[PDB]
Amino acid sequence: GAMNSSNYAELFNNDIKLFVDDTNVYRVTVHKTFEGNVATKAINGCIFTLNPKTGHLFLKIIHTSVWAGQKRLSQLAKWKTAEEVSALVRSLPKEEQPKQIIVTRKAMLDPLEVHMLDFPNIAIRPTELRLPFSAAMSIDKLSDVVMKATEPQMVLFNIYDDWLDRISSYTAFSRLTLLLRALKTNEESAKMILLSDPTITIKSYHLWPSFTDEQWITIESQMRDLILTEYGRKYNV
Amino acid sequence: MNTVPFTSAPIEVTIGIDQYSFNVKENQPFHGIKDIPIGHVHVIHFQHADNSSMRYGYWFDCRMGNFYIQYDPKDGLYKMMEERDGAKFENIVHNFKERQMMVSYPKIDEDDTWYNLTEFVQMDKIRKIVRKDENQFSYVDSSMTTVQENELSDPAHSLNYTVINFKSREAIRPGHEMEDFLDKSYYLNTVMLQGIFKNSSNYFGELQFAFLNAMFFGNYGSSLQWHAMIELICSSATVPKHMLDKLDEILYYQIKTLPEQYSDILLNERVWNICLYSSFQKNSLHNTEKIMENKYPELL
Numbered sequence: 221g222a223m224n225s226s227n228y229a230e231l232f233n234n235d236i237k238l239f240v241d242d243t244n245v246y247r248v249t250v251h252k253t254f255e256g257n258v259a260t261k262a263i264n265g266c267i268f269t270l271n272p273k274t275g276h277l278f279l280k281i282i283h284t285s286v287w288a289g290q291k292r293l294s295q296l297a298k299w300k301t302a303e304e305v306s307a308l309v310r311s312l313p314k315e316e317q318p319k320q321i322i323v324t325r326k327a328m329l330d331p332l333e334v335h336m337l338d339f340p341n342i343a344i345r346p347t348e349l350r351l352p353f354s355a356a357m358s359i360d361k362l363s364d365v366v367m368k369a370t371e372p373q374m375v376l377f378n379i380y381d382d383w384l385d386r387i388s389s390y391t392a393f394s395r396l397t398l399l400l401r402a403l404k405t406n407e408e409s410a411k412m413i414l415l416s417d418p419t420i421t422i423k424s425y426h427l428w429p430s431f432t433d434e435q436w437i438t439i440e441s442q443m444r445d446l447i448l449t450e451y452g453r454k455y456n457v
Numbered sequence: 458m459n460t461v462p463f464t465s466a467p468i469e470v471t472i473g474i475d476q477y478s479f480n481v482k483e484n485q486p487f488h489g490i491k492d493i494p495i496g497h498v499h500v501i502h503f504q505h506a507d508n509s510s511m512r513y514g515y516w517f518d519c520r521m522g523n524f525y526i527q528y529d530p531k532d533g534l535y536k537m538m539e540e541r542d543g544a545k546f547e548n549i550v551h552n553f554k555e556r557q558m559m560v561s562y563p564k565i566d567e568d569d570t571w572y573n574l575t576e577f578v579q580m581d582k583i584r585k586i587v588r589k590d591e592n593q594f595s596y597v598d599s600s601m602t603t604v605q606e607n608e609l610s611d612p613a614h615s616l617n618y619t620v621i622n623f624k625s626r627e628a629i630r631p632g633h634e635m636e637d638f639l640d641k642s643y644y645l646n647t648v649m650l651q652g653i654f655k656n657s658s659n660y661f662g663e664l665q666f667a668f669l670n671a672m673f674f675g676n677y678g679s680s681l682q683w684h685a686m687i688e689l690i691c692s693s694a695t696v697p698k699h700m701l702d703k704l705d706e707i708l709y710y711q712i713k714t715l716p717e718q719y720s721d722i723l724l725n726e727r728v729w730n731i732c733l734y735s736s737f738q739k740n741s742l743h744n745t746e747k748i749m750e751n752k753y754p755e756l757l
């Protein structure tokens with residue numbers, strides 16, 4: 221059934237599962253034409269497919285050429301997502317295939333179910349959580365590889381860097397969702413928080429800075445502050 | 458004209474014959490129904506006055522034998538039976554008619570309703586949906602489940618309607634996932650019409666039979682099949698023009714005959730709003746859209 225606050229620790233059990241977020245698959249800029257009409261220009265996008273237990277991220281880059289000559293692109297984007305997720309599963313060894321796929325938007329349920337008819341034993345599930353994965357393109361290294369791609373490409377990341385060496389996957393996912401919620405609510409401030417101290421660097425093979433345990437507590441507190449603030453600045457409270 | 462005699466009427470019962478019905482009192486001198494039109498299937502159906510639960514009945518075609526009704530006090534229902542002795546049967550009927558103990562099938566001459574509701578319905582196809590090979594007639598009741606309902610529990614007592622499932626490998630060609638799900642013409646024309654039903658007349662016959670079982674017996678399973686078969690056509694961009702014109706006539710007469718007070722449980726707002734206003738065929742069902750909008754504008 222639907223994933224929510226009640227069955228939240230199920231994410232960190234030992235059944236393989238993937239989140240699929242399609243919010244950055246079809247991306248456009250809207251602009252004026254010489255005649256004063258409006259038109260869109262697509263830019264590169266990505267499917268965000270995440271194992272929340274391990275941090276493994278399958279980032280399928282969606283090159284703008286896939287939209288050439290196509291109609292109803294917002295609908296096609298959902299089916300393209302489902303096609304690519306289905307191809308990913310088929311490419312994995314049987315023992316690495318997920319037992320559940322959780323989509324962050326309910327409009328992905330029918331496209332993914334139809335593409336996965338060959339896999340009747342993989343459950344396709346929605347969620348009532350309002351997860352902040354759209355903010356994945358605020359991670360500088362992820363945005364960079366998407367915008368530089370000249371062709372369709374899959375790039376593998378661990379979105380938790382090395383955190384699992386020191387913390388549980390429950391705690392890692394909570395940190396990730398806090399960082400992404402912050403970046404979604406006020407990207408400039410969030411990014412200032414994460415980089416203010418030039419002595420803390422991002423390793424070449426990492427996405428986030430190399431914070432000590434104590435510095436992560438400070439960071440995490442600054443992100444909570446930011447999120448509550450903006451929630452006042454927004455609702456005047 | 459044909460006759461279905463009754464041995465007796467020992468329990469108070471409402472008796473239906475096609476779209477007609479009448480009340481028989483306990484131990485009333487009722488000995489059956491005469492003047493039944495030859496050339497059509499018919500259904501004779503029953504609701505006991507004490508247990509409105511279980512509507513039940515029998516589909517039959519008088520050209521296929523001499524049939525009569527006899528109450529069984531052990532099984533507690535009116536049963537159809539075949540009389541093989543033709544002279545015994547003619548003798549029985551003639552005496553009951555002479556004593557005027559039969560009701561007349563009360564057809565208005567102008568009235569084509571029953572033809573229009575059963576145009577494509579054939580006894581031979583009914584008997585493949587309702588498997589009871591030793592009888593020439595078919596029993597149906599309110600509680601019988603369909604083969605597809607039993608996949609989601611007695612197989613001999615099921616309605617073996619053709620299974621339609623829009624998220625199934627049969628419906629979806631590998632590599633045409635989006636195309637086939639959003640435009641079901643492949644599934645309608647190749648899988649179902651060419652492959653399974655062979656022609657549109659058999660498709661329409663099952664659709665009409667499903668509707669009639671839903672209406673007369675409150676069979677929910679028949680209702681799901683009826684809605685599924687409409688939706689498969691309406692969700693196909695490519696449908697033969699003659700099929701669409703005929704479907705509009707079929708559905709018009711079904712909506713016309715439906716009891717106004719049963720639309721609450723017999724009509725599915727989703728399928729109808731989709732079919733009439735969003736689907737490929739939203740502009741192809743003029744007669745059906747007009748009666749639906751004047752008779753059931755609430756649903757829409």
Ligand SMILES: CCN1CCN(c2ccc(N)cc2)CC1
Nearest residue numbers: 680681684721722723724725726
């Ligand atoms: C107002 C509640 N409606 C829910 C849908 N509707 C329905 C009718 C027929 C079938 N097969 C399935 C559903 C009953 C009325």
